Amino acid sequence: FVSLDSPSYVLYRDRAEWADIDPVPQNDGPNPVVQIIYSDKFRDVYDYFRAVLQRDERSERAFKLTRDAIELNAANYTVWHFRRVLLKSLQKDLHEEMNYITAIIEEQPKNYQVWHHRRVLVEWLRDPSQELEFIADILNQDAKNYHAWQHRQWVIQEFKLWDNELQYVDQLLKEDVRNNSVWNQRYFVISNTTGYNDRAVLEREVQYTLEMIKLVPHNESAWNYLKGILQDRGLSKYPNLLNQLLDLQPSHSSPYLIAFLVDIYEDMLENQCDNKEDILNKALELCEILAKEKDTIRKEYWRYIGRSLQSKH
Amino acid sequence: PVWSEPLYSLRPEHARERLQDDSVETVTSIEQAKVEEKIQEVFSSYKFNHLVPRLVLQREKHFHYLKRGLRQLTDAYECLDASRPWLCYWILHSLELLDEPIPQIVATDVCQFLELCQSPEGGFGGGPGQYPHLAPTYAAVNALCIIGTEEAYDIINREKLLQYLYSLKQPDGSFLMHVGGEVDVRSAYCAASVASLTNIITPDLFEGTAEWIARCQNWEGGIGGVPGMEAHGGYTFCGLAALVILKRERSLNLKSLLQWVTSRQMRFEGGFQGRCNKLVDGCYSFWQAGLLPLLHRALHAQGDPALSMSHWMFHQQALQEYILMCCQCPAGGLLDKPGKSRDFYHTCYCLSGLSIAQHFGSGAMLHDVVLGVPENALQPTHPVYNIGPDKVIQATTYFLQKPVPGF
Ligand SMILES: N#CC1CC=C2CC1Oc1ccc3cccc(c3c1)N1CC[C@H](NCCc3cncn3C2)C1=O
Ligand SMILES: CC(C)=CCC/C(C)=C/CC/C(C)=C/COP(=O)(O)OP(=O)(O)O
Ligand SMILES: OC[C@H]1O[C@@](CO)(O[C@H]2O[C@H](CO)[C@@H](O)[C@H](O)[C@H]2O)[C@@H](O)[C@@H]1O
Ligand SMILES: [Zn+2]
Numbered sequence: 144f145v146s147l148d149s150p151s152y153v154l155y156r157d158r159a160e161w162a163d164i165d166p167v168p169q170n171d172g173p174n175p176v177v178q179i180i181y182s183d184k185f186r187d188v189y190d191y192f193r194a195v196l197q198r199d200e201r202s203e204r205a206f207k208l209t210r211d212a213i214e215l216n217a218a219n220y221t222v223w224h225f226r227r228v229l230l231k232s233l234q235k236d237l238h239e240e241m242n243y244i245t246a247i248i249e250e251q252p253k254n255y256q257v258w259h260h261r262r263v264l265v266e267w268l269r270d271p272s273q274e275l276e277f278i279a280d281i282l283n284q285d286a287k288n289y290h291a292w293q294h295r296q297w298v299i300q301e302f303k304l305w306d307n308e309l310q311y312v313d314q315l316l317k318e319d320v321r322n323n324s325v326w327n328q329r330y331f332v333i334s335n336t337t338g339y340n341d342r343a344v345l346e347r348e349v350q351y352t353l354e355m356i357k358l359v360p361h362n363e364s365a366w367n368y369l370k371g372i373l374q375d376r377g378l379s380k381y382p383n384l385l386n387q388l389l390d391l392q393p394s395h396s397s398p399y400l401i402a403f404l405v406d407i408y409e410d411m412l413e414n415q416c417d418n419k420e421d422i423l424n425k426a427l428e429l430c431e432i433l434a435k436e437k438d439t440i441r442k443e444y445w446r447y448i449g450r451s452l453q454s455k456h
Numbered sequence: 457p458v459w460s461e462p463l464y465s466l467r468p469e470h471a472r473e474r475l476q477d478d479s480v481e482t483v484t485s486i487e488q489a490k491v492e493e494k495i496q497e498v499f500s501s502y503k504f505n506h507l508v509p510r511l512v513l514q515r516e517k518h519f520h521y522l523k524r525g526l527r528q529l530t531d532a533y534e535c536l537d538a539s540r541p542w543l544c545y546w547i548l549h550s551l552e553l554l555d556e557p558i559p560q561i562v563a564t565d566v567c568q569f570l571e572l573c574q575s576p577e578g579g580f581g582g583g584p585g586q587y588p589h590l591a592p593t594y595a596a597v598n599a600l601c602i603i604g605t606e607e608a609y610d611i612i613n614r615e616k617l618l619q620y621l622y623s624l625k626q627p628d629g630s631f632l633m634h635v636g637g638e639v640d641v642r643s644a645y646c647a648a649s650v651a652s653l654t655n656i657i658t659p660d661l662f663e664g665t666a667e668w669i670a671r672c673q674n675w676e677g678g679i680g681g682v683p684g685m686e687a688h689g690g691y692t693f694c695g696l697a698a699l700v701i702l703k704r705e706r707s708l709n710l711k712s713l714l715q716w717v718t719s720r721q722m723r724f725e726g727g728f729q730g731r732c733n734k735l736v737d738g739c740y741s742f743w744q745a746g747l748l749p750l751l752h753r754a755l756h757a758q759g760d761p762a763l764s765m766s767h768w769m770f771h772q773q774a775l776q777e778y779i780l781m782c783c784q785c786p787a788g789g790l791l792d793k794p795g796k797s798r799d800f801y802h803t804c805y806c807l808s809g810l811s812i813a814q815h816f817g818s819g820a821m822l823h824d825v826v827l828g829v830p831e832n833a834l835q836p837t838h839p840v841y842n843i844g845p846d847k848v849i850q851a852t853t854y855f856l857q858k859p860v861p862g863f
Contacts, residue, residue, distance in 0.1 A: 170584050172572055174565040177543040179529045179536075189537075193585055219538040221587045224636050259638040286483070287734065289681070289688065293640075296684050321484035323732040327686040330675050335684075361476045363719070364733050371675030374712065397476075440473070440726070443769045444718040450762035 144207060147184060147214050154184065155191040160204060166190035167197055185215050196225055201232035210243075217247065223256045227263065237268050245277060252281050258290045262297065271302040279311070286315060287324045296331055308332045320355055323364045330371060339372055348372055353387070357395070366399040370406060378403075379410035398438040405429045405448065412456045423456050461510050461828070465726055465777045466503045473723040484733050491735055494794050495725050498782050511780040511828035513810070514788065518803065519556050521788030522547050525800055526562065538582030538589075541573055541596035546804035548602045552844055553807045553834045563603045570596045571611045578613060578620030588620055589634040594646035597653060598843050601851040609854050615861040618656040621647050629664025640681035641672050645694035648701040649841055653848070655855035658863075666704035669695045676732065677712030678720075687716060689730045689744040696750050697840045705754040717747045718770055726774035727782070727793075737792045738783040739802050741809020742842065745770055749839040752818060766823040767816055775813040776827040779806050811837045 145152050155161050168190055171178055181189075192212045195205040209226040212219060230240060244261045251257055265271055275298065281291045299305060309332050315325045337344045349372070355365040373381060385407050388400060408426035416422055427449055434445035464470070475492055477485040502508065526547045536543060544566055551558060572584040573596060579588030580596040600608040624632040624643065631643035644665055651657045671683040672695055678687025679695040696713070699705045720728050720740070728740035748768040755763055783790045783806045789798030790806035811834040816823045826833045838845045 167585075170572060172565070172568050174561075174568070176526060176562070176565050176569045177529060177540050177547070178527065179533045179540075180531055181534060181537075182531050185531065185534055185537075196585070216534060216537050218535060219582070219586075220589055220634055220637060221538065221581065224587060224634075227636060255633075255638060262638070263636075289686065293681060293685050296682075300684075319482035319484055320480075321482050321733045323734070324686050327674070327676070327680075331684050359478045359480045361478055362733075367676055367719075367732060374675075438723070440721055440723040440771050440774060441718050442771065443764065443767050444714070447762055447764065447769055451760075454761045 147188075147211055152184075154187045155208070156187055161191065164191070164194050164198065164200075167193035169193065188212050188215055192222060192225075196221070201229055203233060205229060206233060206235070213247070217251050217254050218256060220256050223260055227260070237264055240264055241268070241273065245273075248277075248281065252285065252288055253290065255290065258294050262294060265298065271298050271304065274298045274302075275304060275307075275311075282315075286319060286322055289324070292324050292328065296328070300335070305332065305336050309336075316355075320359055321362050321364055323367075326364045326368045330368065345372065349381075349384070357391075360395050360397055361399070363399060366403060370403060377410045377414065378407045379414050379416065398433060401429055401433055401437055405433070409448075409452065412452065419456060423452060426452055459510070460506075460508050462508055463502070463511075463777055464771070464773050465499050465781070466508060470724070475724070487735065488733075491793065492724050495736075495782060498794055502781055511777070511832070513780060513828065513832040513834075514784055514786075515554055515831065517786075517788035518550070518784075518790070518807075519554060519788075521785075521798070522550050522554075522556070522800075522803065526551075526566075538586060539592060539595075540583045541570060541580050541592040541599060543800055544570065545595040545599040545602070546800040548599050549837075549843055550800070550804050550807050552602050552847075553811055553837060555835050558603065563605065564607065566599065566603060567605075567608050567611055570600060574611065574613060575620075576616070577623075578616030578618070587634060589637070590624065590631065590643050590646035591633065593617075593620075594649050597650040598841060601653060601841075601847050602843050604847055604850050606854070609851065612654055614654055614656050614855075614858065617650065617654065618658070618661075618861045621651060621656075621661060625661065627664070629662075629666070629668035631665075641669060641679060641691045641694045641698070642681075644669055645698040648698040652701045653841065653851050653855065655852070655858060656860055658860060662702055666699055666702050666707045669699055669704075670707040673708050673713065677709065677714075677716030678731075679708075679713075686731055689717070689720060689728065689740050689747075692717065693743045693746055693750075696747055696754075700750055700754065700840055705750075705757075710751060710754055713747070714751050714769065717744055717751070720744050721770050721775070722778075725782070726771065726778035728775070735793070736778070738779060738790060738809070739792065739805035741775055741779055741783075742805040742812065745775055745809050745812055746839050746842070749812060749817075753839075756818060763818070764816075765818065765821050767825075768812070770813075772813045772816075772825050773827060776810060776825075779810045779813075780828060780832070807834060808837050808842055810834055812839065 156166060188211050192208055195208060206229045209222050212222045241264050244257060244264060248257045248261060265274065278291050278295045281288055299308060312325055312329045312332060315322060333339060339345050352365050352369045388404060391400060405426055408422050411422050412419065430445045430449040434442045475485065475488050573580045575581055575588035577588060579593040581588050582592045600611060626639065630639045631647050632639050633643050651661065672679045674680050674687050676687040679692040680686050680688060681691045699707060722729055722736045725736040727736040727738060728744035729736050730740050748770050752763060752768060782794050785791055785798040790803045791798045792802055814824060814826050814834060815836050836845055838848045841848055
């Protein structure tokens with residue numbers, strides 16, 4: 144009906160349709176702490192929300208009241224729960240509620256409660272037809288919104304909507320190849336579809352990642368993904384990778400490349416490699432270089448790695 | 457000279473740590489470059505050629521800001537009306553870290569207020585009359601423990617608290633944040649924290665939880681909110697701390713976790729980012745850096761012979777430089793980064809992080825590194841609960857003398 148900012152908005156204590164119920168003030172005690180000096184409109188709405196809640200009144204007026212309470216504080220999970228209880232009691236039209244939550248999330252996309260409310264609605268309706276497009280719009284405004292991506296993984300997995308996600312991933316990587324949330328989605332999609340055991344898939348991924356690295360050598364996300372898709376089997380298991388990284392050494396170096404080399408040497412030594420002494424010396428030399436010059440912020444970590452390597456080999 | 461102290465961030469080679477965007481600009485590099493430009497300006501304001509005055513933590517300013525907030529707040533805090541126990545915790549823990557005594561009158565008032573926030577079904581809500589929720593429950597319990605009086609301890613209805621935890625436990629090992637609420641790693645940590653502190657852990661309460669948390673660790677090495685999601689310092693702290701309480705740290709790949717968190721410290725700013733390719737933020741001084749003492753303890757328990765006996769595995773000095781030079785509000789309180797508004801949340805975690813960066817402890821080994829004037833030294837904080845270690849011992853000792861509700 145009328146919003147909190149509408150020129151004709153009227154406080155609940157002044158509404159005739161609410162005169163029959165007494166408001167319930169908040170009890171903060173005689174000597175309150177962390178007491179918020181609420182605006183008159185904020186307190187007004189909540190004094191009545193408290194009355195309806197305490198009264199467990201499942202009514203249309205209570206339902207509308209929750210919308211105002213939510214506008215005043217969308218993080219109030221108690222209000223959301225009650226609104227949910229009313230949605231069921233009053234048998235409200237869920238598609239109508241979906242349009243509501245859609246607008247709310249657009250205004251406050253980083254709020255936990257709004258995303259959970261939407262998930263509940265989709266679960267109740269068993270209808271994900273609007274999800275991928277809605278999330279895409281939110282992400283178009285903030286490509287890294289954590290809740291947006293989480294909701295996206297849930298919908299895709301729960302309703303098996305994998306078909307076009309890899310294309311969506313490729314598009315966003317083109318827009319910003321440094322978007323770590325997108326690289327994460329990439330792993331999410333592949334591990335849940337083809338998996339990485341398919342050597343043709345793994346090769347495609349390694350080639351794709353290597354090309355991104357050469358395009359943006361200092362983009363950490365690509366380096367992390369490269370190690371991420373190879374670590375479980377063991378970095379020393381890919382002899383050609385070591386050589387290809389070694390060639391880029393001079394004309395492409397960076398703490399990321401040097402660090403990856405140490406990771407390879409670590410795994411090699413862990414697998415009874417040939418020329419153990421030589422590999423150990425190389426690894427120790429790189430740890431020193433990283434500690435003293437190329438990655439000093441991580442000096443303690445690299446010294447630790449140096450000592451670990453020595454205690455093991 | 458005792459009146460001049462060279463800083464890591466002010467070394468000439470430090471300029472080399474500036475972002476290298478490879479001449480390929482994207483929203484990510486542009487935002488990172490903006491932050492770096494501002495931080496460099498800040499860093500330079502603390503250097504006068506070879507004269508580099510000792511950094512100073514503005515204790516008194518922070519104290520007055522905290523003292524004031526503990527009683528009242530402007531409507532600017534209406535957005536936190538469902539998180540008042542958090543305000544109590546953030547403020548009390550900040551004062552505790554600053555070694556600022558808590559008046560008996562204030563302590564009892566806090567106790568009374570948190571009592572009003574406690575739900576008859578168990579747990580605490582965001583305010584009087586609100587439904588219980590694991591987040592404010594975690595905050596309230598910590599606050600009561602910081603106060604540490606029998607009065608505070610006894611406010612907690614342990615019987616109902618345990619029943620409440622049970623009412624949120626899922627069969628896959630995870631927990632709901634509240635009835636009809638969302639689930640993510642934060643719930644597991646909140647539950648393990650309050651349950652271990654109040655001695656209400658039963659053999660089946662956390663059955664399956666450790667495995668569910670391990671499933672949250674991803675390809676990056678860090679931990680996401682739920683299985684499949686991006687690694688984030690916040691969820692990683694929650695996951696590892698919870699596993700430490702459960703004594704199941706080994707369920708994770710500690711190697712990939714260690715390498716991931718150490719990579720989250722920014723080479724230029726000195727502080728920590730929350731996830732790869734995002735921005736530095738003072739609050740991660742705790743969420744991220746706090747993972748190192750936890751990892752240290754975990755590896756130590758395994759007999760790791762390479763562990764340091766004097767330092768955490770991150771740049772302690774650099775983190776202190778970022779916090780002291782870039783996260784203090786002139787008017788009192790701390791923050792995310794220069795240009796942001798102060799708030800009690802950032803005040804709490806920036807200080808918590810500063811304390812961790814200042815104090816190393818493992819076995820009988822103790823090594824402090826207090827940058828700046830000696831008065832900058834803060835009281836130590838427990839890496840798992842983030843309240844004084846003394847408070848943890850006193851609380852656990854007290855509750856261990858009580859039986860687990862209904863065994
Ligand atoms: N749970 C959770 C979290 C989700 C996202 C975080 C931090 C974070 O850690 C938190 C711990 C405790 C909290 C207690 C009450 C309200 C919180 C909150 C956040 N929220 C919800 C989100 C809102 N904005 C936070 C913005 C913020 C500031 N610094 C890091 N941030 C990212 C905010 O202040
Ligand atoms: C016990 C408890 C409640 C712990 C909370 C821990 C914590 C800090 C969680 C953060 C989760 C999250 C969704 C971050 C993204 O916010 P963002 O995009 O605003 O931040 P970012 O850019 O730094 O990632
Ligand atoms: O950090 C990698 C490490 O995490 C584990 C869980 O402890 O698995 C995660 O990462 C794998 C990719 O490396 C994913 O397939 C898996 O789903 C995710 O949980 C360990 O198995 C792994 O060594
Ligand atoms: Zn922050």
